[PDB]
Design a protein around this motif. Structure first.
Motif, mmCIF file in Angstrom:
data_model
loop_
_atom_site.group_PDB
_atom_site.id
_atom_site.type_symbol
_atom_site.label_atom_id
_atom_site.label_comp_id
_atom_site.label_asym_id
_atom_site.label_seq_id
_atom_site.Cartn_x
_atom_site.Cartn_y
_atom_site.Cartn_z
ATOM 1 N N UNK A 1 -27.020 24.056 5.466
ATOM 2 C CA UNK A 1 -25.759 23.789 6.142
ATOM 3 C C UNK A 1 -24.993 25.092 6.308
ATOM 4 N N UNK A 2 -24.051 25.110 7.240
ATOM 5 C CA UNK A 2 -23.208 26.280 7.422
ATOM 6 C C UNK A 2 -22.299 26.463 6.211
ATOM 7 N N UNK A 3 -22.111 27.715 5.803
ATOM 8 C CA UNK A 3 -21.310 28.040 4.627
ATOM 9 C C UNK A 3 -19.949 28.633 5.011
ATOM 10 N N UNK A 4 -18.857 27.905 4.706
ATOM 11 C CA UNK A 4 -17.471 28.235 5.075
ATOM 12 C C UNK A 4 -17.020 29.666 4.753
ATOM 13 N N UNK A 5 -17.452 30.220 3.623
ATOM 14 C CA UNK A 5 -17.111 31.599 3.282
ATOM 15 C C UNK A 5 -17.743 32.573 4.269
ATOM 16 N N UNK A 6 -18.937 32.226 4.739
ATOM 17 C CA UNK A 6 -19.726 33.114 5.587
ATOM 18 C C UNK A 6 -19.085 33.322 6.952
ATOM 19 N N UNK A 7 -19.200 34.544 7.456
ATOM 20 C CA UNK A 7 -18.672 34.893 8.765
ATOM 21 C C UNK A 7 -19.420 34.128 9.850
ATOM 22 N N UNK A 8 -18.722 33.787 10.946
ATOM 23 C CA UNK A 8 -19.389 33.175 12.103
ATOM 24 C C UNK A 8 -20.550 34.024 12.617
ATOM 25 N N UNK A 9 -21.523 33.361 13.246
ATOM 26 C CA UNK A 9 -22.795 33.936 13.710
ATOM 27 C C UNK A 9 -23.782 34.136 12.557
ATOM 28 N N UNK A 10 -23.307 34.042 11.320
ATOM 29 C CA UNK A 10 -24.220 34.113 10.187
ATOM 30 C C UNK A 10 -25.054 32.840 10.122
ATOM 31 N N UNK A 11 -24.382 31.702 10.256
ATOM 32 C CA UNK A 11 -25.051 30.411 10.334
ATOM 33 C C UNK A 11 -26.006 30.350 11.521
ATOM 34 N N UNK A 12 -25.565 30.912 12.642
ATOM 35 C CA UNK A 12 -26.329 30.897 13.882
ATOM 36 C C UNK A 12 -27.425 31.959 13.881
ATOM 37 N N UNK A 13 -28.640 31.553 14.227
ATOM 38 C CA UNK A 13 -29.778 32.467 14.251
ATOM 39 C C UNK A 13 -30.079 33.007 15.648
ATOM 40 N N UNK B 1 -8.640 40.413 19.955
ATOM 41 C CA UNK B 1 -8.800 41.859 19.781
ATOM 42 C C UNK B 1 -7.962 42.461 18.652
ATOM 43 N N UNK B 2 -6.700 42.049 18.535
ATOM 44 C CA UNK B 2 -5.813 42.619 17.518
ATOM 45 C C UNK B 2 -6.176 42.086 16.136
ATOM 46 N N UNK B 3 -7.072 41.104 16.102
ATOM 47 C CA UNK B 3 -7.676 40.658 14.853
ATOM 48 C C UNK B 3 -8.815 41.616 14.504
ATOM 49 N N UNK B 4 -9.154 42.479 15.464
ATOM 50 C CA UNK B 4 -10.062 43.609 15.241
ATOM 51 C C UNK B 4 -11.422 43.205 14.685
ATOM 52 N N UNK B 5 -11.681 43.625 13.450
ATOM 53 C CA UNK B 5 -12.964 43.422 12.783
ATOM 54 C C UNK B 5 -13.363 41.953 12.825
#
Lengths: 169, 169
Positions: free
Chosen positions: B66-78, B165-169
């Protein structure tokens, strides 16, 4: 101990395989392109001695037709064959030959194409001179080969021959 | 020749699941189909690009388990990073236990096998024929944006072009 072989070169113009048409039959033509799969050399009957023919007619000449069987045609007299040929191999003079299928060259062929190519048969001492990958000037002799019509008392296709070949290209 | 999927029903939706298991076989082609309006084929002797006018949709099943909430987006996605800007929008479906909604859920799962018809108190389902005819009545309409709404589509989109964008990283 003499069988003479003709070769004609420096022909008017190079023609394509796409340029290959039925008019060219029995005619000289220059074509060039890349080798595919040189096959081992095996003798050309030319003429054979086969007889008798019931029981010894010893008739030796001709039978040069493209089958190449057979002798025993209209012998002896009087041997009356029919019958067996019977094959007489030893008196038959032989020559050449190997089948080398030429492929149409890439530089000219119009991608996407998948170049459609046919066989160059090497009859004549010009046999074997070729090397795989090279493009080479050839002599035309369009003609045809046996395997739409049938001779009622078949199927045919392009058979390219050259009495002359050069390695240019 | 049979094109499947993106050819088979065109100017219509493609519906995918296991979309990460499509390998690279589908991946680069559909990677084109986000430029839409084509599918190129150089295979064999056929060089055409045939229309895939197909609409695209997938059910994205993230990697195990399952997708892990702590993990950054696209991490779940392969999937490739370049392919997810190609879709317009995506809805992530998290299944999070709630001692409230999982009640009505389990009652929804136990509404089977007790009954056949699930819904009540109240909705009346809207059937496909009559609905599809308005849905096909609409595609003919062809709206034309007023400029006021156009400029509004620009302005809030500037801060949309700023906060991501201003959220940057």
């Amino acid at each position: 101990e003499r069988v003479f072989q003709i070769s004609f070169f420096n022909l008017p113009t190079v023609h394509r395989i796409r340029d290959i048409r039925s008019e060219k039959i029995g005619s000289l033509l220059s074509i060039s392109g890349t080798v595919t799969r040189t096959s081992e050399v095996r003798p050309e009957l030319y003429k054979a001695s086969f007889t008798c023919d019931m029981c010894r007619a010893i008739v030796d000449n001709v039978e040069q037709s493209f089958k190449y069987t057979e002798p025993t045609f209209c012998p002896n007299p009087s041997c009356e064959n029919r019958a067996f040929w019977t094959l007489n191999v030893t008196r038959s003079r032989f020559l050449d030959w190997q089948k080398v299928r030429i492929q149409e060259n890439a530089n000219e062929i119009p991608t996407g194409s998948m170049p459609r190519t046919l066989d160059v048969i090497l009859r004549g001492d010009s046999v074997e001179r070729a090397k795989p990958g090279d493009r080479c000037k050839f002599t035309g002799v369009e003609i045809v080969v046996p395997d739409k019509p049938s001779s009622t008392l078949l199927t045919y296709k392009i058979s390219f021959l050259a009495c002359h070949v050069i390695s240019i290209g | 020749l049979e094109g499947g999927a993106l050819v088979l029903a065109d100017n219509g939706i493609c519906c995918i699941d296991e979309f990460d298991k499509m390998d690279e076989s589908d991946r680069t082609a559909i990677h084109e189909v986000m430029e839409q309006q084509t599918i190129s084929i150089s295979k064999a002797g056929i060089n055409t690009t045939l229309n895939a006018r197909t609409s695209i949709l997938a059910a994205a099943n993230p990697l195990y388990g399952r997708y892990n909430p702590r993990l950054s987006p696209l991490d779940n996605i392969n999937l490739p990073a370049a392919l997810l800007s190609r879709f317009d929008i995506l809805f992530l479906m998290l299944d999070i236990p709630s001692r409230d909604d999982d009640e009505k859920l389990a009652e929804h799962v136990t509404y089977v096998h007790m009954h056949n018809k699930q819904p009540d108190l109240d909705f009346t389902p809207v059937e496909p024929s009559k609905m599809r005819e308005y849905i096909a009545y609409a595609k003919t309409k062809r709206p034309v944006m007023s400029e006021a709404v156009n400029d509004y589509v620009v302005q809030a989109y500037i801060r949309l072009r700023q906060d991501s964008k201003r959220e940057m990283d």
